[PDB]
């Protein structure tokens, strides 16, 4: 096939619709696509294979509202030739799991990088489909290995594109591709979880440029912080992308002399200029300015919530005005309501268009559990607050005073934008497994020693028997646990402290230190030192991978803050309304010209060669 | 100037400046073949210590505010009526509890005169929150800091 | 496979725990080796059919 192509076969003339339908009609039988095609044409009762069936199978193998061109384009229903012969024969090759034929057809193609990323998506998704289904044969490791090969090819083409020209390669990553359902290469590289592609320098520099949305590259945090609240300083001290590009072009025109005698992506990647009012809205629309705003608003919330919890949270009495409620607590209700709205619109703006699928992908990351938990816990506390009864009021204030933990621990996501703290916070969650295993083994020793200790000190009936069930159950767990950290109860477990600890049995007075001594050998100088050894072992292995995981998560970070409301933390809820007005009325990419799209295809193809 | 307040300021300032004049000795110790490289290794480990303290400070303050809120209710009978001791106690007691100074008599019912009388429901919440804090501080973060130093020691 | 002696490969602990004390639930919810092998063979006989007609 390679030899026929490079001698005298032209796929524009060769491939008609009937040949393509004949190619899909004669799939082997031992492949993964054959059950999928049979199941698709099994429903809706169609006896002959056509491209609508193949389109729908390709659509369900790429779940994020993908739209295959077979379902819409007029050339694939039932002479002028087909629009993309190399692409759809390449798609047939990768769906049949033919390695060499797919490679041959990949090398003779228009978009190598996008095709490679789509291939890897298709392969690993049908691999997982083959794995989890009983009526499809498990060839999953073969499909994952083939997906990995296409991932390497995509990175290789990007690397060569980066080495030739660093700027236009970043433009290459944000091209609105027409043959891949208006989806860009960066989104394709996120759909298939390709960490090696996103971790590459070109993508990382692009993400930093998108983070600095229509704003100079070396604008520091404090300069943004000042200009966020004083919008009269927005024009003099903040530089922009047109200004630095004008300076570079004006310089480079002089170097050639002889020595003697919603349009943010456009203004980033074009020679567009900003007036006065444009570069105010463009400053507020930048992700980094929204982030700085979020941080200031979040600090205000924590101090406000810490004040009400520590100093002033009285009980509800109908006699006093407003129920004797300080305005602080009403401002707290306002901000928590703002966070609730933020989480609602984070749920609503997910890639799938099914409420179950939105919810399923919304609970993929573990922060959203903590978000919805802390918000639910807060609403329950404020519902319980108003009833004027000491028991449930005590329940209300305790629930708030424990919810402070979750709202403060939630700060670690805004700390994870840092280059150094980010990877460390990934390393911690990877060490939680070893901590869990340690605690299980420790719990077995703790409970063994605990039951023995309490049984020996306090006999079961008698004079020294403590006549209370709950304190017995809690003491078994309690005293062994504190004895780990050097709180040895040597006066207590021996004869002394009859009033505080309770009087011990005469034979318990000498058993207790002996059992303690043995417990202290097997706990402090064996298990704890073994835990140190386990962490040092796993730290190097996790060090290699946790950086890539942080690199990959920067896309979600940028995409999150790209979609956040425009206005600042104090008025952020007012800003939120404008999204509601836009929604009731009824993005990181650029549309190129046909001439430019042709030029970019030619340059990408030469880089692949 | 002959005034007790600013004289107290004078002697305190001298008695703290002794630290900097003694710590300045480490430059004359760094002419040695063996001690010199070690003193360079220390300043390269200060970055990892700084990152550790930031993460530790987040856990410390979370636990601190929760602990103090639960023990001493905001208005009422058990509310300590003093702003500065509240602000300093939130930071103080969680910090000493890292190094094995567990205030188990104090955070429970006992020591009403020294520590202050605790709320009846704080008497049983405080050890439970302490127990959780001691897992996530002593047997997770401190052991992780040991792992970080051993990793970076070879490279440095 | 010997550990899963004459019982489906993906039968979880709790399903066994329920069926151990309630032996009336033993038939409906516990799958077995013949059932999964019959399913695989019945599928693989169908995969050999032609895609058209
Ligand atoms: C009144 C006070 C207002 C203070 C506002 C601080 C503004 C933060 C933004 C910032 O500084 O950006 C920093 C980014 O790196 C980080 O953001 C890493 C995380 C640190 C920020 C959080 C600090 C603690 C406040 C939250 C605590 C929560 C409560 C915790 C309660 C326990 C630095 O950015 P830059 O280097 O200058 O950018 C230029 C280069 N670049 C664009 C190429 C990258
Ligand atoms: C050191 C590291 C800090 C770590 C954070 C420590 C956590 C605490 C900091 C965070 C919460 C902020 C609490 C302080 C603000 C409230 C002041 C106040 O109580 O008002 C008082 C006056 O005003 C005093 O100046 C009056 O008090 P009131 O009568 O009750 O009204
Ligand atoms: C009484 C009840 C109180 C219980 C309080 C316990 C509260 C438990 C809070 C659980 C949330 C932590 C996981 C966050 C997460 O989503 O994972 C992220 C990583 O997260 C990290 O960066 C490391 C997290 C370590 C925090 C360990 C718990 C802090 C306890 C503080 C101890 C203070 C003492 C408390 C007393 C990544 O998620 P993803 O990759 O995006 O998917
Ligand atoms: C996270 C910890 C849960 C936070 C939930 C917080 C919500 C709590 C709501 C219920 C509060 C009722 C208080 C009460 O009635 O006090 C009575 C006296 O109480 C005692 O003297 C102690 C008796 C044991 C308490 C229950 C077991 C505690 C340990 C196990 C608790 C698990 C009167
Ligand atoms: C209870 C609450 C207590 C109050 C706490 C409030 C504290 C207020 C804090 C205010 C100060 C905020 C400073 C943030 C800037 C950090 C330095 C920096 O620029 O990051 C640089 C790194 O730097 C390290 O090398 C670059 O980081 P990057 O670009 O992200 O990579
Ligand atoms: C509080 C009490 C302290 C004990 C309880 C708290 C300690 C943490 C609980 C961990 C839950 C299980 C778990 O996550 O699996 C973990 C591994 O461990 C296993 O897979 C072993 C499975 C047995 C779990 C039952 C332990 C009984 C604890 C009672 C022991 C006998 C008494 C890790 O999961 P991962 O997916 O690999 O990441
Ligand atoms: C490094 C530490 C700074 C050394 C500076 C050293 C120079 C100090 C010069 C001022 C000394 C004034 C002493 C005084 O007037 O005592 C009065 C009573 O003081 C008290 O009872 C305590 C009140 C709190 C003190 C201020 C906060 C201390 C913690 C935060 C301090 C930060 C009377
Ligand atoms: C508060 C104050 C308390 C009093 C403290 C006063 C203590 C007075 C101390 C007085 C004794 C000083 C001895 C210095 C000589 C060290 C040994 C030596 O020769 O160095 C050799 C190394 O040696 C190691 O291997 C060579 O070192 P190099 O050539 O540099 O390489
Ligand atoms: C005393 C209180 C204890 C906390 C304060 C003392 C702890 C040391 C302070 C370190 C200052 C920042 C710094 O040096 O960067 C360091 C990295 O860390 C970062 O780059 C994160 C940037 C956020 C810094 C603000 C932390 C707020 C602490 C409050 C946390 C929330 C409460 C290292 O810098 P380097 O250049 O890489 O070397
Ligand atoms: C009322 C309560 C009844 C609870 C019954 C638990 C049933 C245990 C069996 C079980 O879950 O199997 C687990 C196996 O892995 C293990 O068994 C590892 C050890 C954990 C089990 C012991 C838990 C602690 C109870 C004992 C403490 C002793 C007293 C300690 C006193 C200090 C999970 O099996 P599976 O994954 O679902 O299997 C499917 C996949 N597979 C077949 C391919 C493998
Ligand atoms: C727990 O209850 C037991 C049984 O009522 C008590 O044991 C008795 O104590 C009295 C007074 O010291 C003795 O005269 C009896 O001989 C004991 N009974 C038996 C069967 O030996 C015990 O005092 C109670 N303990 C506490 C701490 O309250
Ligand atoms: C802190 O101040 C509060 C308010 O003045 C005091 O609470 C009152 O204490 C008295 C005497 O025990 C009671 O009769 C009142 O019912 C309490 N007031 C309320 C509103 O409940 C409290 O005693 C002070 N605490 C300290 C430690 O000084
Ligand atoms: C570290 C090596 C040498 C093991 C030491 C074990 C020691 C600490 C253990 C083993 C036997 C124990 C002793 C057994 C008998 C007595 C007599 C009386 O006074 C009560 C405690 C006391 C004194 C115990 C103290 C702790 C003890 C001495
Ligand atoms: C190490 C493993 C087993 C976890 C142990 C957790 C223990 C130490 C925690 C969890 C629940 C806590 C108990 C909760 C209730 C009580 C009743 C009363 O007496 C106050 C403290 C006391 C007794 C607490 C002591 C500490 C405690 C027992
Ligand atoms: Ca969220």
Numbering used by the authors:
A (entry chain A): 469 to 546, 573 to 755, 812 to 1136, 1148 to 1170
B (entry chain B): 937 to 1092
C (entry chain D): 703 to 755
Paper text:
TRPM2 belongs to the M (Melastatin) subfamily of transient receptor potential (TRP) ion channels. TRPM2 is a Ca2+ permeable non-selective cation channel opened by simultaneous binding of three obligate co-activators, cytosolic ADP-ribose (ADPR), Ca2+, and membrane phosphatidylinositol 4,5-bisphosphate (PIP2). Similarly to other TRPM subfamily channels, homotetrameric TRPM2 channels contain an ~800 residue N-terminal region, a transmembrane domain (TMD), a TRP domain, and a coiled-coil. In TRPM2 a C-terminal ~270 residue NUDT9-homology (NUDT9H) domain serves to bind ADPR.
Here, we determined the structure of the TRPM2 channel from the cnidarian Nematostella vectensis (nvTRPM2) in complex with Ca2+ by electron cryo-microscopy (cryo-EM), at a resolution of 3.1 Å, and correlated the structure with detailed biophysical characterization of channel permeation and gating properties. The C-terminal NUDT9H domain, however, is entirely invisible in the density map, indicating that in the absence of ADPR this domain is flexibly linked to the core structure. The selectivity filter is short and wide, the diameter at its narrowest point is ~5.2 Å, larger than that of TRPM4 (~4.2 Å). The nvTRPM2 filter is lined by the backbone atoms of Y1035 and G1036, and the side chain of E1037. The external vestibule of nvTRPM2 is lined by a double ring of negative charges, the side chains of D1041 and E1042 of the post-filter helix (LDE motif, inset), and additional negatively charged side chains (E1046 and E1050) line the upper parts of the vestibule. As observed in other TRPM family channels, the gate of nvTRPM2 is formed by the S6 bundle crossing which constricts the pore to a diameter of less than 2 Å between residues I1082 and N1086. Because that diameter is too small to allow passage of a water molecule, the observed nvTRPM2 conformation must correspond to a closed gate, as expected in the absence of ADPR. Although the nvTRPM2 structure was obtained in the presence of trace amounts of Ca2+ (free Ca2+ concentration in an unbuffered saline with no added Ca2+ is in the micromolar range, for example, [Csanády and Adam-Vizi, 2003]), clear density for a bound Ca2+ ion is seen, occluded into each subunit. The Ca2+ binding site, formed by the cytosolic ends of transmembrane helices S2 and S3, and the S2-S3 linker helix, is located at the membrane-cytosol interface, and is accessible from the protein surface through a narrow opening (‘peripheral tunnel’). The bound Ca2+ ion is coordinated by the side chains of residues E893 and Q896 of S2 and N918 and D921 of S3 in a pentacovalent geometry, E893 provides two coordinate bonds to the ion.
